[PDB]
Please model this.
Amino acid sequence: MTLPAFKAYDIRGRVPDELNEDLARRIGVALAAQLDQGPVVLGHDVRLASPALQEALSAGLRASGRDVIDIGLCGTEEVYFQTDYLKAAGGVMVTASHNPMDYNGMKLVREQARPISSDTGLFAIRDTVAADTAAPGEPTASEQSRTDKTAYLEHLLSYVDRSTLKPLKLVVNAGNGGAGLIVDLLAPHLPFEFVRVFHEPDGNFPNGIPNPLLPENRDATAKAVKDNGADFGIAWDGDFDRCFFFDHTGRFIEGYYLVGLLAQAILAKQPGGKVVHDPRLTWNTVEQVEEAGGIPVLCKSGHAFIKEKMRSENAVYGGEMSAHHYFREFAYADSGMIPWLLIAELVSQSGRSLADLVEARMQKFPCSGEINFKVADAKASVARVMEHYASLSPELDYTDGISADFGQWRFNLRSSNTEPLLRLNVETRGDAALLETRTQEISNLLRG
Ligand SMILES: C[C@]1(O)O[C@H](COP(=O)(O)O)[C@@H](O)[C@H](O)[C@H]1O
Ligand SMILES: [Mg+2]
Model:
């Protein structure tokens, strides 16, 4: 057997049987042996066990001669930013993002906040930790506390021309995660009126786990937008590397359309740039990027693939439909803060509502949203789908599972790299009826 907490892209486990202070200390020792020379940035989220896991990590790192820079309670993107900004050897965020209260985890990066994933170091660490029965050494290096967020805040604000911002009324919903701290620190520098929902950080999560995809959690943001006449609403997961948008009618915006919107907003500042996108839903992003004078670059989904493709392409922006937005100037890392700043600027500068900015894109490229299927035999289910459609001779692409382009409609069908599911995305060229009949047809085949 192997330690179950070591996943494809990060560490995630129930505390204390799958993840605990002793494992965390061992992870720190193992990480020291994997990095180039330099100090290691540590930060943590609002979960009750997160401080103690970070302290154990720090103890293992310092026992192995690593200086530790403790940036304190923060968002995941702040570990990325500070790891790059401080020219650190690496960084670790202690977080379970959006998982239940008895779970925690770690996200690990090396120099320039490049990801450490299962095949790029994480499983090496796992196997080292699994075999480590050595006595815990004593610290041979120092810890410095560096909680100053000024550089990070200035960097966020550099994405917008503040003299063009209007005093929009924005609902913000931290979900009792960590986002509210950053909103409040940005607020003196912005003209917006914030309506704060579930704002105070609270690791007991009295209003539910910070997962804005849960319909009941969506409804708190929607209600606040509608009841206050807000221009739009923003909700974050617990470590706020994902943000979610609600238009002035309270409508949750499907994240697909944000990729094209943010690409056009970015390409205004940075003309002719490359934009990386995933293969699940594509047509709208390709069109919007091209119409803004950018170059769209198809990439396998998943932050490690997206970031490495952005690096190799010098891409200014990368976006996934699942609320991940990456920015070259942000060390090619994802931010849950930069996106709503860009959208607030777009609404301010264009005189258009968020609703209207995306409405014609939704009409032009209606999509199913991601639909998940737990099936008995994923390979046999996919084969059932492909055999059914074979006589139509779709254009097939294997960048990430199977993409089939039929002309007026297309789908992508993937096995997940983090769960044992099949995931389906369908979109059409302005045809809602075709979207539904094909989505239901594929759904029946997959369940068959
Ligand atoms: C961890 C993670 O959040 O999991 C998402 C879903 O990955 P998947 O199950 O393969 O569809 C990825 O898109 C995302 O980039 C990655 O950061
Ligand atoms: Mg997260």
User: Anything to note?
Assistant: The two ends are 33 Å apart (CA to CA).
